[PDB]
């Protein structure tokens, strides 16, 4: 009863037999399973259309592209570089991250500082 499910042509991500809120990777990439009444009267935990924009959720930062899926990896958005961790889609933020053996600094807002830190 756990995991990604499609019910009545709506997508949900279940834990404890209940739809969870968050950004989770179903069979169709990372989707935003949102609280009820976030967009177009979605119900609790339904995956919503959420496109070409950032999402701040519980002090983490995601970016959704043009298909309502959270991006991963290096991304250049509004003049800045971000790196969205492949296994969570959360932006690297708050200090030093080692990515493919190189160390970079990312601000609290997820923006990569110029240059290499180690």
């Amino acid at each position, epitope marked *: 009863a756990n995991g990604y499910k499609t019910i009545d042509n709506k997508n949900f991500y279940f834990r404890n037999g209940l739809p969870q809120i968050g950004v989770f990777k179903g069979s169709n990439g990372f989707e935003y399973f949102a609280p009820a009444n976030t967009d177009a009267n979605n119900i609790e935990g339904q995956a919503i259309r959420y496109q070409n924009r950032f999402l701040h959720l519980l002090g983490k930062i995601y*970016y959704f592209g*043009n298909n309502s899926k959270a991006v991963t990896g290096w991304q*250049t958005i*509004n*003049g800045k570089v971000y790196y969205f961790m492949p296994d969570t889609a959360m932006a690297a933020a708050g200090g030093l991250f080692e990515i493919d053996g190189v160390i970079y600094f990312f601000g609290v807002d997820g923006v990569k500082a*110029p240059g290499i830190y180690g």
Partner: nanobody
Amino acid sequence: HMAQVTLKESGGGSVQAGGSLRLSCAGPRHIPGSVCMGWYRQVPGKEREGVALILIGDGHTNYADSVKGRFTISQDSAANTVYLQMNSLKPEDTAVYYCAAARGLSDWTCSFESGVNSWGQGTQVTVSS
């Protein structure tokens, strides 16, 4: 893979030798991966040459030797948009300047060589004696 992007250009113009002009080039707000943006120039009848590139969100610059110390490339601090400040213009700078976007190299540098992914439609700059 780097999808093609639209590059919208503005600026240019016509000046006497010694003048200054600015170009601007805007890309889409979101480009996956790393991106070098800037300009090449081509006089009708001649070959295209690199002018200046910058790696957006990091800042490596690459300039043609013929424009170093006269043209400066910068990025907008809130957009996937670059500017070329063309100071100390010479008649030999007269050309069509084309905005370009290309993937950043793995060491966070931009090269004029090995391919451009997307081009702007071009801006004429004319400098008279």
